[PDB]
Amino acid sequence: TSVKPIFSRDMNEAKRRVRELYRAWYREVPNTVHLFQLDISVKQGRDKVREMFKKNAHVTDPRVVDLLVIKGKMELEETINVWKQRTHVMRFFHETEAPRPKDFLSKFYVGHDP
Amino acid sequence: ASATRLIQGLRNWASGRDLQAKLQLRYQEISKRTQPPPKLPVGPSHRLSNNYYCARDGRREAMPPSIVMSSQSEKKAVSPAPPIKRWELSQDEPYL
Amino acid sequence: TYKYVNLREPSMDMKSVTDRAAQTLLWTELIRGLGMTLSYLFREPATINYPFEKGPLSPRFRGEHALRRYPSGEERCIACKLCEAVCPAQAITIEAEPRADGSRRTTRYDIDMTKCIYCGFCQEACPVDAIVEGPNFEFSTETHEELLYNKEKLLNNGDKWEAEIAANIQADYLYR
Amino acid sequence: TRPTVRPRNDVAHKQLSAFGEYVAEILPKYVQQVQVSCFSELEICIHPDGVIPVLTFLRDHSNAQFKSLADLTAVDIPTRQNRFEIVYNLLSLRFNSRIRVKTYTDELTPVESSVSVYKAANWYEREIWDMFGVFFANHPDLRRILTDYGFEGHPFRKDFPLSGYVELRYDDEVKRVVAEPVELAQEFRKFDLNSPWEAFPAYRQPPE
Amino acid sequence: LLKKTTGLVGLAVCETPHERLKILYTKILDVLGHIPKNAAYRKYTEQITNEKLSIVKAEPDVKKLEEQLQGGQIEEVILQAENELSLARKMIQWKPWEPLVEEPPASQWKWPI
Amino acid sequence: PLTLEGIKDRVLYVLKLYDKIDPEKLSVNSHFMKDLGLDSLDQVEIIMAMEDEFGFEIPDIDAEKLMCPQEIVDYIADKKDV
Ligand code: SF4
Ligand code: SF4
């Protein structure tokens, strides 16, 4: 059952890495909003950051969350430098996407999808 | 090829070469666009006897790779091949 | 087996030195390049007068697709679906049913000219020479939807270009 | 079997078998398998922990001198528990030879990077990380190299569909290029072309 | 002979190839003396290095030394000696003559699946 | 920054500036996870507000043990002269 670690031996250092990545994203959100001339406020960007971290918050494997921290670090570096355009930053906010119905009755009305 | 002799002479002087010997514009020297019909030959397997497919099946002679070592004396050291031979300089145009 | 490009040592006698210095001061090779471009000015240009003159082509040329017929009016396609099976871009859609006299004929034959890569696999996978790639290439359209051919469009293309497609096939069929 | 069958090389087969024995005997700590194919190609399957020592030996030994790294690839085989097979192709100009070094890893185990041996491995395993999600430890600068800047998922894996999950279109309301769930006007038609009859009896697997 | 240029860019011409090669081969032998005797790497590299050292010591001229060493120029032979010394030190550090670290799974190298 | 009363007032003021937490239940000895029901990330951005307003950074070793405002006041009193 012994496996080779990536960066974190157990869950505590993995949680520290998650904490540091969240701090870096929270610091960069105002500069990302200003430099890209986004139509959102700083609060909406920070709520999106917190929403992504909360969506990804049911994992207990140290290697999986190490890979998640690594991919978040790549995204943060991708945004700090101007490599993403405005479309890549705004792709987190699905503005043009139609609201998907959630209850049973509307899904029954619109199609066969469960 | 329709150029005058004076223009040909000036062209050859300024170019430094005889341009009329090797013209880049094609003329009636090329092959015609309508050709007589061909008759292509047949291959070596177009025979009526001694032509069994089991005697010339290339794909069926392919074998699985031979396992040399598996984990399930004073022998000489071995290179992957004899060492490559040194290249010889070109006799035609060595640029030397 | 190999040769030494750019391994010529420069001579250091006074003749070669003065030749190189005169070439530096008087710009000899620049005059050489100028003179040869001047010589290239006085040649007949290789430009043809399109659309009044067309570039040369071959009977193997792959242009617009067409559906052919037997020399009795009957169409050649018998709905064997080999062309849509061999199509590397999946540009062909075929649907078939037996028609009134029981013949095996297509009811739908679509070729997406925006998916097709003009590779000619369909005209060489056809056992009856039904689908062909005709010699026409000037069929640019102003709309995307005009490039989605159905069976009627391909049959019209065949009826339009039969007098050339049959001659090209007659010229080339001995090489196949 | 003269005209239409590929002629067989046996001197090269003998030499490659001898060199495979040589390598597998010099490095027993990492080498797990050595095989030579029908068309005289030598494959050395090793443990993932010995990627650096085996490659450094093959690069620096006087009897190996495999100075060129031609290609670095990963292959996705989902039925294995270590589904990713990492393949190094090496070329030796001194002896005019080629070798293949294979190792394995799964999704969560990192592999030691071979930038410190061969410098082409930088971009090659950056591409491998981009397409298969295989992490390479001790890399100088590991990011994506071919996919889109906001792309999620590794496309060369075999559970990733051919057409992706999103598609791009220009929206005039937001005056921007936007990504939407994928919808195809014509679905990609799947063809079942496998013959139900056995083709090559020499590759027959034993029954359970 | 005093070759002006070895032919390869960045490879400087060696003025005294014999002393350099002898020093490098003896250094390789002293480094390899630390590896255990039963290790096949030590036996093979000792054999090939002793052959190369005898060939170098038995030939005063360089052109016939280059011809019978079968390694191209003498400077790339010196380069290969340096690379072999570096590999010998790294192989002292790694110790790859030990038994196999771990067996693969049952169908790790089975193709086709 | 020089007096403990001013330190406590600045800490408590910028804690009242935090939007999602009521000022009524906030005292000097209120926990974060079980008193106001703040998340881990809530405490994280509270600590980043601490560094943003007090002008000195806080590492992740010692930011994990700041659950009530008295602990924050005592820590930043340790890091300063006071
Ligand atoms: S030319 Fe090739 S790509 Fe085009 S329809 Fe024929 S088979 Fe398909
Ligand atoms: S290959 Fe020829 S006969 Fe067969 S379906 Fe296509 S066009 Fe028709």
One-letter amino acid of E76: E
Residue in this structure with the two tokens 């700090």, named with its chain if needed? A80
Q: Determine whether the interchain pair E80/D65 forms a contact, defined as Cβ–Cβ distance below 8 Å.
A: yes
Q: Determine whether the interchain pair A20/F41 forms a contact, defined as Cβ–Cβ distance below 8 Å.
A: no
- CA of C81 from ligand 1 middle (Å) equals 13
Report the residue of B72, B75, B88 to disrupt the E interface, i.e. the one with the largest count of E CBs within 10 Å.
B75
d(CA C121, CA F45): 64
Q: Which two tokens stand for residue E34?
A: 């630390």
CA nearest ligand 2 atom 7, residue: C131
Query: Which chain D residues in 164-193 lie under 8 Å from chain B, judged by CB atoms?
Result: none
Contacts of B27 (CB under 8 A, 6+ apart): B1
Per-position DSSP letters for C8-70, written without gaps between them:
-PPP-SHHHHHHHHHHHHHTHHHHHHHHHHHHHHTS------TTTS-----TT---SEEE-B-
Q: Which two tokens stand for residue D99?
A: 């070798």
Q: Which two tokens stand for residue F81?
A: 């002269």
SS3 E40: helix
Vertex C111 angle, CA C109 and C117, to 5°:
150
Query: Which chain E residues in 38-67 lie under 8 Å from chain D, judged by CB atoms?
Result: 40-41, 44-45, 48-49, 52
d(CA E19, CA E16): 6
Question: For residue C76, what are the domain limits?
Answer: 64-173
Partner D contacted by A1 (CB < 8 A): no
d(CA D87, CA D67): 16
Q: Which two tokens stand for residue C50?
A: 């399109």
Helices (H), chain A: 11-35, 42-55, 62-80, 86-90, 104-110
d(CA A107, CA A109): 5
Peptide bond preceding E112 in cis form (omega within 30 of 0): yes
Per-position DSSP letters for chain D, written without gaps between them:
--SSSPPPPSHHHHHHHHHHHHHHHH-TTTEEEEEE-TTS-EEEEE-GGGHHHHHHHHHH-TTT---EEEEEEEEE-TTSSS-EEEEEEEEETTTTEEEEEEEEE-SSS-EE--TTT-TTHHHHHHHHHHHH---EES-SS---SSS-TT--S-TTSTTS-SS-SEEEEEETTTTEEEEEE---SSPPPP-----SS---GGGPPPP-
Contacts of E3 (CB under 8 A, 6+ apart): E13, E73
C-alpha C38 chain-centroid distance: 35
Contacts of C172 (CB under 8 A, 6+ apart): C59, C60
Query: Which chain F residues in 22-41 lie under 8 Å from chain A, judged by CB atoms?
Result: 40-41
Vertex B35 angle, CA B30 and B36, to 5°:
145
Give the ligand whose atoms come closest to the C-alpha of residue C82. Answer: 2
| Closest among F51, C54, E67 to F72, alpha carbons compared | F51
Vertex D109 angle, CA D106 and D114, to 5°:
100
- Cα-atom radius of gyration of chain C, to the nearest Å? 29
Cβ atoms of C38 and B14 closer than 8 Å: yes
F41 to chain A: which residues are within 8 Å by CB? Answer: 22, 50, 53
d(CA F52, CA A45): 19
Backbone break loci in chain B, preceding residues, C–N > 2.5 A: 72
Element (H, E) at E25: helix E17-32
Give the minimum alpha-carbon distance from C36 to chain B in angstroms, rounded to a whole number: 5
SS3 F76: helix
d(CA D147, CA D132): 12
Environment class of C96 (CB within 10 Å of its CB; exposed 0-12, middle 13-18, buried 19+): middle
Residue in this structure with the two tokens 């097979």, named with its chain if needed? D85
Task: Tell me whether residue C119 is annotated as binding.
Answer: yes
DSSP symbol at B86: P
DSSP symbol at C136: -
Q: Which two tokens stand for residue D64?
A: 């190996």
d(CA E83, CA E78): 9
Regarding the beta carbon of C154 and ligand 2, being less than 6 Å apart is answered no
- Resolution in angstroms for this experimental structure? 3.2
- Residue D35: phi and psi, rounded to 5, are -140, 155
- CA of C89 from ligand 1 middle (Å) equals 7
Regarding the beta carbon of C85 and ligand 1, being less than 6 Å apart is answered no
Regarding the beta carbon of C81 and ligand 2, being less than 6 Å apart is answered yes
d(CA F47, CA F41): 10
d(CA F64, CA F69): 13
Residue in this structure with the two tokens 């490098």, named with its chain if needed? E24
User: In terms of residues, how long is chain B?
Assistant: 96
Give the minimum alpha-carbon distance from D60 to chain C in angstroms, rounded to a whole number: 28
Nearest residue of B to residue D6, measured between CA atoms: B58
Q: Which two tokens stand for residue A101?
A: 């119905």
SS3 C132: strand
d(CA E82, CA E26): 12
* B86 vs E43, E47, E72: nearest CB: E72
Regarding the beta carbon of C82 and ligand 1, being less than 6 Å apart is answered no
Q: Which residues of C104-143 are buried (b: 16+ CB within 10 A; e: fewer)?
A: ebbeebbbbbeebeeeebbbeebeebbbbbbbbeeeeeee
Q: Determine whether the interchain pair E71/B76 forms a contact, defined as Cβ–Cβ distance below 8 Å.
A: no
| Closest among A4, A1, A109, A24 to A66, alpha carbons compared | A4
CA atoms in the 13 A half-sphere facing the CB of E110: 15
Q: Which two tokens stand for residue B19?
A: 């341009």
CA atoms in the 13 A half-sphere facing the CB of A8: 21
Regarding the beta carbon of C111 and ligand 2, being less than 6 Å apart is answered no
d(CA A67, CA F79): 35
Regarding the beta carbon of C87 and ligand 1, being less than 6 Å apart is answered yes
- Please count the other Cβ atoms lying within 10 Å of the Cβ belonging to residue C71: 8
Q: Sign of the C-alpha dihedral, residues E56, E61, E63, E67?
A: negative
Indicate if F74 belongs to the active site. Answer: no
Q: Which chains touch D (3 or more CB pairs under 8 A)?
A: A, B, C, E
Residue in this structure with the two tokens 């369909």, named with its chain if needed? C122
d(CA C156, CA C158): 5
Q: How many domains does chain A have?
A: 1
Contacts of D43 (CB under 8 A, 6+ apart): B65, D33, D34, D35, D36, D37, D100, D101, D102
Task: Tell me whether residue C171 is annotated as binding.
Answer: no
Q: Which two tokens stand for residue C118?
A: 């003009």
Partner B contacted by D56 (CB < 8 A): no
Element (H, E) at C95: strand C92-98
d(CA A93, CA A100): 15
C56 to chain B: which residues are within 8 Å by CB? Answer: 33
| Closest among D77, D84, D81, D71 to D132, alpha carbons compared | D84
d(CA C134, CA C127): 17
Environment class of B9 (CB within 10 Å of its CB; exposed 0-12, middle 13-18, buried 19+): exposed
Cβ atoms of C3 and B94 closer than 8 Å: yes
Cβ atoms of E44 and B78 closer than 8 Å: no
Q: Which two tokens stand for residue A71?
A: 């991919």
SS3 E99: coil
- Cα-atom radius of gyration of chain A, to the nearest Å? 18
CA nearest ligand 2 atom 6, residue: C83
Cβ atoms of A70 and D135 closer than 8 Å: yes
Angle between helices C28-41 and B5-15 (to 10 degrees): 150
Contacts by A77-84, CB closer than 8 A, 24 or more apart: A77/D143, A78/D143, A78/D149, A79/A28, A79/A32, A80/A28, A82/A35, A83/D149, A84/D149, A84/D150
Give the minimum alpha-carbon distance from A30 to chain D in angstroms, rounded to a whole number: 20
Contacts of E74 (CB under 8 A, 6+ apart): E14, E17, E21, E62, E65, E66
CA nearest ligand 2 atom 3, residue: C77
d(CA A57, CA B8): 84
d(CA D17, CA D3): 28
Q: Which two tokens stand for residue E91?
A: 């192989």
Regarding the beta carbon of C80 and ligand 2, being less than 6 Å apart is answered yes
d(CA D156, CA D158): 6
Give the minimum alpha-carbon distance from D184 to chain C in angstroms, rounded to a whole number: 13
Environment class of D208 (CB within 10 Å of its CB; exposed 0-12, middle 13-18, buried 19+): exposed
- CA of A109 from ligand 1 middle (Å) equals 42
d(CA E77, CA E52): 10
A91 to chain D: which residues are within 8 Å by CB? Answer: 150, 178-179
Angle between helices E40-57 and D11-26 (to 10 degrees): 110
Q: Which chains touch C (3 or more CB pairs under 8 A)?
A: B, D
How far CA F74 is from CA of C35, F26, F50, F70, F82, in Å, comes to: 88, 17, 13, 6, 10
C93 to chain D: which residues are within 8 Å by CB? Answer: 186
One-letter amino acid of D98: R
Q: Determine whether the interchain pair D60/E84 forms a contact, defined as Cβ–Cβ distance below 8 Å.
A: yes
d(CA D13, CA D31): 20
Q: Sign of the C-alpha dihedral, residues B11, B16, B21, B23?
A: negative
Look up the CATH number of the domain holding residue C75: 3.30.70.3270
Q: Which two tokens stand for residue D76?
A: 């996705």
Peptide bond preceding C51 in cis form (omega within 30 of 0): yes
Give the ligand whose atoms come closest to the C-alpha of residue C87. Answer: 1
Q: Determine whether the interchain pair E47/B83 forms a contact, defined as Cβ–Cβ distance below 8 Å.
A: no
Q: Which two tokens stand for residue F66?
A: 């700041």
- What number does the ligand 2 atom closest to the CA of C86 have? 1
Q: Determine whether the interchain pair E105/D80 forms a contact, defined as Cβ–Cβ distance below 8 Å.
A: yes
Regarding the beta carbon of C30 and ligand 2, being less than 6 Å apart is answered no
Question: For residue A48, what are the domain limits?
Answer: 1-114
Touch criterion met for F and A (3+ Cβ pairs within 8 Å) = yes
Cβ atoms of D42 and D34 closer than 8 Å: yes
Vertex F66 angle, CA F63 and F70, to 5°:
140
- Residue F66: phi and psi, rounded to 5, are -125, 85
CA nearest ligand 1 atom 2, residue: C119
F45 to chain A: which residues are within 8 Å by CB? Answer: 26
Partner D contacted by A100 (CB < 8 A): no
d(CA E15, CA E18): 9
**Helix/strand/coil percent split, chain F, to 5:** 45, 0, 55
| Closest among D64, B76, D61, D30 to E28, alpha carbons compared | D61
d(CA D47, CA A25): 39
Cβ atoms of C76 and C151 closer than 8 Å: no
| C171: β partners | none
How far CA D140 is from CA of A77, B6, D87, D136, D175, in Å, comes to: 14, 68, 21, 10, 38
| Closest among E106, E69, C51 to D94, alpha carbons compared | E69
Active-site choice (F9, F22, F35, F39): F39
Give the ligand whose atoms come closest to the C-alpha of residue C121. Answer: 1
Element (H, E) at C167: helix C151-172
Cβ atoms of E55 and E69 closer than 8 Å: yes
Per-position DSSP letters for E52-98, written without gaps between them:
HHHHHHT---SHHHHHHHTSSSHHHHHHHHHHHHHHHHHHHHH-TTS
- What number does the ligand 2 atom closest to the CA of C78 have? 3
Q: Determine whether the interchain pair D189/C90 forms a contact, defined as Cβ–Cβ distance below 8 Å.
A: yes
